[PDB]
Enzyme design. Structure first.
Site, mmCIF file in Angstrom:
data_model
loop_
_atom_site.group_PDB
_atom_site.id
_atom_site.type_symbol
_atom_site.label_atom_id
_atom_site.label_comp_id
_atom_site.label_asym_id
_atom_site.label_seq_id
_atom_site.Cartn_x
_atom_site.Cartn_y
_atom_site.Cartn_z
ATOM 1 C CG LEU A 76 -0.247 0.077 2.559
ATOM 2 C CD1 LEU A 76 -0.262 1.525 3.009
ATOM 3 C CD2 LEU A 76 -0.949 -0.809 3.580
ATOM 4 C CE1 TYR B 171 8.719 3.449 -11.036
ATOM 5 C CE2 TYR B 171 8.618 5.749 -10.305
ATOM 6 C CZ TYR B 171 8.687 4.810 -11.333
ATOM 7 O OH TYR B 171 8.732 5.231 -12.653
ATOM 8 C CE1 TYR C 294 5.539 7.186 -7.466
ATOM 9 C CE2 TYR C 294 7.253 7.856 -5.935
ATOM 10 C CZ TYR C 294 6.265 6.972 -6.309
ATOM 11 O OH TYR C 294 6.003 5.871 -5.536
ATOM 12 N NE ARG D 41 -10.005 2.898 -7.105
ATOM 13 C CZ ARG D 41 -9.838 4.074 -6.503
ATOM 14 N NH1 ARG D 41 -8.617 4.511 -6.214
ATOM 15 N NH2 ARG D 41 -10.895 4.814 -6.187
ATOM 16 C CB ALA D 42 -2.875 3.862 -6.521
HETATM 17 N N1 NAD Z 1 1.776 0.589 -10.199
HETATM 18 C C1 NAD Z 1 3.072 0.896 -10.238
HETATM 19 O O1 NAD Z 1 3.446 1.356 -11.440
HETATM 20 C C2 NAD Z 1 3.999 0.770 -9.102
HETATM 21 C C3 NAD Z 1 5.383 0.768 -9.253
HETATM 22 C C4 NAD Z 1 6.386 0.547 -8.248
HETATM 23 C C5 NAD Z 1 5.935 0.339 -6.887
HETATM 24 N N2 NAD Z 1 4.578 0.346 -6.681
HETATM 25 C C6 NAD Z 1 3.999 0.109 -5.350
HETATM 26 O O2 NAD Z 1 3.076 -0.975 -5.421
HETATM 27 C C7 NAD Z 1 2.252 -0.852 -4.218
HETATM 28 C C8 NAD Z 1 0.788 -1.164 -4.570
HETATM 29 O O3 NAD Z 1 0.360 -0.199 -5.522
HETATM 30 P P1 NAD Z 1 -0.419 -0.511 -6.898
HETATM 31 O O4 NAD Z 1 0.279 0.459 -7.793
HETATM 32 O O5 NAD Z 1 -0.515 -1.946 -7.329
HETATM 33 O O6 NAD Z 1 -1.746 0.124 -6.596
HETATM 34 P P2 NAD Z 1 -3.013 -0.362 -5.900
HETATM 35 O O7 NAD Z 1 -3.780 0.923 -6.050
HETATM 36 O O8 NAD Z 1 -3.676 -1.633 -6.321
HETATM 37 O O9 NAD Z 1 -2.597 -0.632 -4.345
HETATM 38 C C9 NAD Z 1 -2.551 0.294 -3.238
HETATM 39 C C10 NAD Z 1 -3.587 -0.075 -2.223
HETATM 40 O O10 NAD Z 1 -3.423 0.618 -0.945
HETATM 41 C C11 NAD Z 1 -4.715 0.790 -0.345
HETATM 42 N N3 NAD Z 1 -4.645 1.980 0.523
HETATM 43 C C12 NAD Z 1 -4.558 3.356 0.500
HETATM 44 N N4 NAD Z 1 -4.526 3.956 1.676
HETATM 45 C C13 NAD Z 1 -4.593 2.898 2.573
HETATM 46 C C14 NAD Z 1 -4.620 2.854 3.973
HETATM 47 N N5 NAD Z 1 -4.590 3.934 4.738
HETATM 48 N N6 NAD Z 1 -4.695 1.638 4.570
HETATM 49 C C15 NAD Z 1 -4.683 0.517 3.807
HETATM 50 N N7 NAD Z 1 -4.746 0.419 2.472
HETATM 51 C C16 NAD Z 1 -4.664 1.670 1.885
HETATM 52 C C17 NAD Z 1 -5.706 0.949 -1.536
HETATM 53 O O11 NAD Z 1 -6.984 0.404 -1.338
HETATM 54 C C18 NAD Z 1 -5.013 0.246 -2.707
HETATM 55 O O12 NAD Z 1 -5.612 -1.025 -3.041
HETATM 56 C C19 NAD Z 1 2.412 0.582 -3.684
HETATM 57 O O13 NAD Z 1 3.106 0.490 -2.473
HETATM 58 C C20 NAD Z 1 3.195 1.248 -4.770
HETATM 59 O O14 NAD Z 1 4.015 2.261 -4.246
HETATM 60 C C21 NAD Z 1 3.688 0.495 -7.776
HETATM 61 O O1 TCC Z 2 4.421 4.015 -6.168
HETATM 62 C C1 TCC Z 2 3.952 4.144 -7.462
HETATM 63 C C2 TCC Z 2 4.914 4.318 -8.543
HETATM 64 C C3 TCC Z 2 4.459 4.462 -9.914
HETATM 65 C C4 TCC Z 2 3.043 4.432 -10.209
HETATM 66 C C5 TCC Z 2 2.083 4.256 -9.131
HETATM 67 C C6 TCC Z 2 2.540 4.111 -7.748
HETATM 68 N N1 TCC Z 2 1.597 3.931 -6.643
HETATM 69 C C7 TCC Z 2 0.962 5.081 -5.943
HETATM 70 C C8 TCC Z 2 1.195 6.499 -6.254
HETATM 71 C C9 TCC Z 2 0.520 7.527 -5.516
HETATM 72 C C10 TCC Z 2 -0.388 7.187 -4.471
HETATM 73 CL CL1 TCC Z 2 -1.198 8.463 -3.606
HETATM 74 C C11 TCC Z 2 -0.638 5.793 -4.136
HETATM 75 C C12 TCC Z 2 0.035 4.749 -4.870
HETATM 76 CL CL2 TCC Z 2 -0.302 3.066 -4.436
#
Ligand code: NAD
Ligand code: TCC
Ligand code: NAD
Ligand code: TCC
Lengths: 229, 60, 60, 229
Positions: A120, A171, A181, A222-223
């Site tokens: 998260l 990330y 970012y 989604r995020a």
């Molecule tokens: N998508 C990317 O391109 C990317 C890249 C590198 C790292 N990450 C990391 O992957 C992880 C998951 O992100 P994702 O991108 O798959 O998105 P995701 O949106 O599926 O996951 C994030 C989740 O955190 C939950 N969230 C927000 N506030 C919260 C809280 N207070 N308590 C508990 N849950 C809470 C949301 O419901 C959401 O499902 C994050 O830590 C993100 O930084 C993502």
């Molecule tokens: O950590 C990330 C790196 C690249 C793309 C998406 C994310 N995830 C992310 C961003 C911003 C917020 Cl507010 C919450 C999340 Cl889970």
């Protein structure tokens, strides 16, 4: 009897889900920790069989979900929740969703677990760049995205077997600059990565537990779409 | 068109491995890090990004 | 008493994980990296050292 | 139908052996690359059952060694070998031990492989500190320990399937100073880690092959005792 708690799953479009799916291939029981704001939407779409497709592990394997609990990483204990969110529409009908409460909850029904996933992150001002992020927005990013990892560890360590393993998602924006970012998210990741090392020392020396962090590439989650830049 | 689409497009064009990055790609690596197979790895930042991070200057 | 004995005694006393580093510990990680399970990983230096590399200042 | 070639074995007390053991657990055929000087002694101990216990894969499994071949990483092609070795009592009763030669040999006998392990290192002046290492010793260390990886890839990529994987072994002395690790070995490892990145680019783009390096912790092996300090 492998049990894993995945904290941070709101749908099937994120990393939390791909992790869940892959763990199922190895037959580990999965416990989801859903954020209250989207807890009912998730449960609904689940019951109405809108995820059955996504629960297919190719090899006829059906994703086996042990439980689905409401969870909010911004609250350590019950008296940490403010009156506002306590009476909020989406929170009113729920309980035992703080970090301490879910740990105690999982311990009672299933006993000690051996795998924990921190999946998260959150930031109110992710749309603003660092220079224009307010103190409030910044501390909010670190509170939700970084400290929540330290807290999960502090409480779950008591319900984890020796030689257990913990991981989180980071990330590259923490090491090299990627404009867009913002909101202190890059800050949150740099902190998380540094904290992984320190916690690795304390958890390894005292509980013989491991903790690592995966720095993933881009995934249209989604995020990820929230990052308007 | 948001940061994400640029990042995805940039990765798929300049990473050492040009293939779509799936959530299960991170999933299997996570699975490995959580199993006893990695008992000797702790406190690490493991990159699962088709190797994009090793690049400095893009091609074209 | 030879470079290797010192390094090993040091590793077992100050590394985050106080356990013996077996050749099979490196073997299991090698096994993973050589399999398709790690298709998204390339050009990396993975540390299989019980985490000694993260330490700066020792306890004793 | 996985086949892995391990370049760098002389006994069951090093990393090559541990890697071979673990790969067998997953039913991968193993081919050992033995340095000519110790090839015959190795075959002797192998034939006399001296390694039998070391070949038992816990689960009642037996390590499946497809073949064992003389291999010297300091020679790329047949016409690279000088007179001094061409007349050496050891390299006499041997042929086809150059990098290009063993790749052709393997390809001919077993077809294409999909796993390569670089587990060799050598340095004439490993006992002297960097400042006192001669140009000859320094280059010999980089030739045997670093370039050998590049040459391996150049010649074996022709007998490897798409999506094959390659790894090598390195040590943290390349990033931080550890006194006693001399003879230019730290220099060679620093180069090996950098080349791994560069090769990742070329091998990934042109052949869809991956290459990584494992930085291992201490292990009491034969070549490890060789370091005097
Ligand atoms: N998508 C990317 O391109 C990317 C890249 C590198 C790292 N990450 C990391 O992957 C992880 C998951 O992100 P994702 O991108 O798959 O998105 P995701 O949106 O599926 O996951 C994030 C989740 O955190 C939950 N969230 C927000 N506030 C919260 C809280 N207070 N308590 C508990 N849950 C809470 C949301 O419901 C959401 O499902 C994050 O830590 C993100 O930084 C993502
Ligand atoms: O950590 C990330 C790196 C690249 C793309 C998406 C994310 N995830 C992310 C961003 C911003 C917020 Cl507010 C919450 C999340 Cl889970
Ligand atoms: N043992 C450790 O503490 C340690 C730590 C980190 C990295 N490493 C790396 O692990 C790898 C394997 O080393 P090990 O320490 O297990 O020792 P090892 O002695 O089993 O392996 C090294 C091998 O290289 C071979 N060799 C020397 N010159 C050669 C040549 N010209 N052609 C082909 N083979 C040749 C030797 O026969 C020997 O088997 C090395 O690359 C080393 O740098 C080891
Ligand atoms: O790379 C190493 C790190 C720590 C202990 C031993 C080694 N290996 C090594 C040393 C010196 C020489 Cl000449 C050959 C080898 Cl394989």
């Amino acid at each position: 009897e492998d049990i894993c708690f995945i904290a941070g799953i709101g749908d099937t479009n994120g990393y939390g889900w791909g992790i869940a799916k892959e763990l199922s291939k190895r037959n580990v029981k999965i416990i989801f920790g859903i954020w209250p704001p989207v807890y009912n939407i998730f449960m609904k779409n689940y019951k109405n069989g809108k995820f059955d497709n996504d629960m297919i592990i190719d090899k006829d394997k059906k994703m086996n979900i042990l439980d689905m609990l409401p969870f909010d990483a911004s609250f350590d204990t019950a008296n940490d929740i403010d009156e506002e969110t306590k009476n909020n529409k989406r929170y009113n009908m729920l309980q035992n969703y703080t970090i301490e409460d879910v740990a105690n909850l999982i311990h009672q029904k299933y006993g000690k677990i051996n795998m924990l996933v921190h999946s998260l992150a959150n930031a109110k001002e992710v749309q603003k760049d660092l220079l224009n992020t307010s103190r409030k927005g910044y501390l909010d990013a670190l509170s939700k995205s970084s400290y929540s990892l330290i807290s999960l560890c502090k409480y779950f360590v008591n319900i984890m077997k020796p030689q257990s393993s913990i991981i989180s998602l980071t990330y590259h924006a923490s090491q090299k600059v990627v404009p867009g970012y913002g909101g202190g998210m890059s800050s949150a990741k740099a902190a998380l990565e540094s904290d992984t090392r320190v916690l690795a020392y304390h958890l390894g020396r005292n509980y013989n537990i491991r903790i690592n962090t995966i720095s993933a590439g881009p995934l249209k989650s989604r995020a990820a779409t929230a990052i308007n830049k | 068109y948001t940061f994400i689409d640029y990042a995805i497009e940039y990765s798929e064009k300049y990473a050492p491995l040009r293939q779509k990055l799936l959530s299960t790609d991170i999933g299997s690596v996570a699975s490995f890090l959580l199993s006893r197979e990695s008992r000797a790895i702790t406190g690490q930042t493991i990159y699962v990004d088709n190797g994009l991070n090793i690049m400095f200057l893009p091609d074209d």
